[PDB]
Amino acid sequence: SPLLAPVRQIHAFGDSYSDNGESQRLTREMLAKGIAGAQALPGEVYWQGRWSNGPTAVEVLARQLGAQLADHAVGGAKSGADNYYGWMSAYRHTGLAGQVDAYLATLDGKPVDGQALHFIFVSANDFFEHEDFAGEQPLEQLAGSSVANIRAAVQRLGEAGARRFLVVSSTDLSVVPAVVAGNRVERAQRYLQAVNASLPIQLAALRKTRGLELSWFDHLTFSRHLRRNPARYGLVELDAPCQPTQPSVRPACANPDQYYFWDEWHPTRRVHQLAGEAMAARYAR
Numbered sequence: 001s002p003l004l005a006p007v008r009q010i011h012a013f014g015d016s017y018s019d020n021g022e023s024q025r026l027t028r029e030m031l032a033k034g035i036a037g038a039q040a041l042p043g044e045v046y047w048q049g050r051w052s053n054g055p056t057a058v059e060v061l062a063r064q065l066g067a068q069l070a071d072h073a074v075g076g077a078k079s080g081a082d083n084y085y086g087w088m089s090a091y092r093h094t095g096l097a098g099q100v101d102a103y104l105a106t107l108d109g110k111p112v113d114g115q116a117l118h119f120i121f122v123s124a125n126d127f128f129e130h131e132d133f134a135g136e137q138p139l140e141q142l143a144g145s146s147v148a149n150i151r152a153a154v155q156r157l158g159e160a161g162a163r164r165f166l167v168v169s170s171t172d173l174s175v176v177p178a179v180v181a182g183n184r185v186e187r188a189q190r191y192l193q194a195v196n197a198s199l200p201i202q203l204a205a206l207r208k209t210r211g212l213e214l215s216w217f218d219h220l221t222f223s224r225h226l227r228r229n230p231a232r233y234g235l236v237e238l239d240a241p242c243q244p245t246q247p248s249v250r251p252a253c254a255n256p257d258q259y260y261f262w263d264e265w266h267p268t269r270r271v272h273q274l275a276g277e278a279m280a281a282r283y284a285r
């Protein structure tokens with residue numbers, strides 16, 4: 001199958017797996033304004049506003065493709081309007097649907113770039129918020145909502161003029177250290193299988209109806225290759241965070257590039273690099 005056409009501009013939408021500074025900017029604005037419950041995100045033990053110790057995967061992807069990046073993703077973002085952090089809603093809707101809305105409002109009349117790649121990577125916070133705040137919805141129904149929400153984002157961007165998309169699957173929530181510690185490995189498996197079975201069917205139907213260029217990145221296949229043969233990728237430690245934060249911050253491991261996880265939820269820069277390189281692989285430079 002032929003490589004897809006080159007990419008010169010990316011518009012990225014999603015959560016802390018893509019965020020390159022928005023949760024930092026937004027939370028300082030929320031702190032300055034006095035919004036109740038606001039905290040400085042991501043925190044002290046993170047690199048330059050990323051929720052990791054280096055560039056996120058979409059930033060690597062942009063580098064790999066020779067593209068410029070406008071990264072609208074916000075740490076904590078859910079697939080609908082709002083954030084894992086409920087207190088942000090008093091200031092901005094920073095979920096995927098919020099990000100789409102702000103991107104389209106910020107065009108200032110001008111058209112959508114029909115050549116820009118619209119990059120969508122979200123859903124983990126749907127599961128985390130459900131599990132952390134005792135959500136009552138069955139997981140299959142939550143998965144349904146996540147899927148609807150993502151499809152609706154692509155439909156809305158398409159309606160406004162976007163033509164090119166890369167949508168990332170659920171990551172393997174089942175091996176995230178926070179999920180292991182919460183004894184929630186089976187819930188994560190069931191959730192991520194339901195999103196990843198359904199989403200690509202919905203996206204294929206939309207891609208055909210609206211004549212889109214839509215690529216699907218299966219992040220679970222990707223992390224299964226990394227975790228089955230880690231020495232091949234220079235990785236040694238697959239389960240412990242390099243930078244513990246929970247219950248409290250402790251000293252970082254000395255060899256973070258041999259680690260899969262930076263904190264209890266987020267991958268290291270080395271995993272982000274590998275993912276961004278893999279994501280670039282269906283596109284011509």
Ligand SMILES: CCC(=O)SCC[N+](C)(C)C
Pocket residue numbers: 015016017051074075076077084124125128265
């Ligand atoms: C995990 C994908 C994200 O955006 S991190 C946001 C906050 N949390 C406590 C790690 C869920």
